[PDB]
Design a protein around this ligand. Structure first.
Ligand code: ZN
Ligand code: ZN
Lengths: 113, 119, 113, 119
């Protein structure tokens, strides 16, 4: 039913870990995905605002920092705004199902629980 | 132009088996056990439906990075391309994944990530 | 390298088939994907502007109409605008690799070439 | 919670084999031949690399819709979920696709689509 995607990229900044009145934790961060080339590299670019919640949000929070190369699988969510202030605005966000630091150019010590 | 790609989440059946080709190129093997949930629309709660087993081989330094970072039953995210090998009996084809990116899922766990060094 | 997605939904309107000075054809259309429910259906929603080019653009043009339920595989492309007129705008579009009418609630006569 | 999903583009090895379960539910089988391109970075142009063969089974009216709409070598788009069956020799597992949506690709062809009737 939903539209899902996988985006590989680096966090543009440390994950903002804020809490809701009810206590549940929410982690926000935008992944910036940037491509490859030939003969000379680099181009394209894609910045997707993401949000994970619950314990995954705190793990994201305590396990990721700026520049971190991540793998993110989630659901695209989009909202459509105004006209009574200007004229047609669209925004998009990714509800993260799973995310983890990528092991393509690095390592990590994974501690269970 | 492009291969068929998939993102599979699951657990490592066993630690990554790191070997090296004759030329020296590293190669890590493992299989992800992706278990989907099923809901008995009548009592009980969610259930562990039929699991999928996908063997995956990652190459070069990524593989070495795997061998040194992931272990048994670790939950991981795998983005890769489906490749159909061919092994003979005694015809036979089998479908495995060639990893492009893989990382530990921060779902039920944390991780200390050490960047390597390039840019 | 690129970020790809698959969106199943219906065209919100017939595909605009316009041509470029050079002659190549371009088909534009926005797919509107809307979900399922339980116990009572319907919710969510996602509208993604798409564009196919070349012969696929004309085939899309002559094979699809409004309401058509399609399957679309492409690449997300996003651009970031202004600040010298207002303050930060983001837009997204799907460069369609493959698209075809879905056979979930219909049929179609496929004529080769 | 969710299965592993994939979008595979390719051609039908053969016309869809439509059969019916004992209860009456329709079932169509077929396999997509997805051929990826390879570039000899030295002369020649693009090349037809190693193809992937995935068997797919679609259900109910969708299947009937398949049987009545698709034929041999037709290019199609398939969105589905990977399912691992189990058949025994003489153990054995195999990976096939359970289609959720499938349609003829308007890449190298057109199509006349007849909506059915619901909403
Ligand atoms: Zn090496
Ligand atoms: Zn039926």
């Amino acid at each position: 039913g939903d539209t899902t995607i996988t985006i590989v990229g680096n966090l543009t900044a440390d994950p903002e870990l804020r809490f809701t009145p009810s206590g549940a934790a929410v982690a926000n961060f935008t992944v910036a995905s940037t491509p490859r080339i030939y003969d000379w590299k680099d181009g394209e670019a894609l910045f997707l605002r993401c949000n994970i919640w619950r314990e995954a949000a705190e793990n994201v929070a305590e396990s990721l920092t700026r520049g971190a190369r991540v793998i993110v699988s989630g659901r695209l969510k989009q909202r459509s705004f105004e006209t009574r202030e200007g004229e047609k605005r669209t925004v998009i966000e990714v509800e993260v199902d799973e995310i983890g630091p990528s092991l393509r150019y690095a390592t990590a010590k994974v501690n269970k629980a």
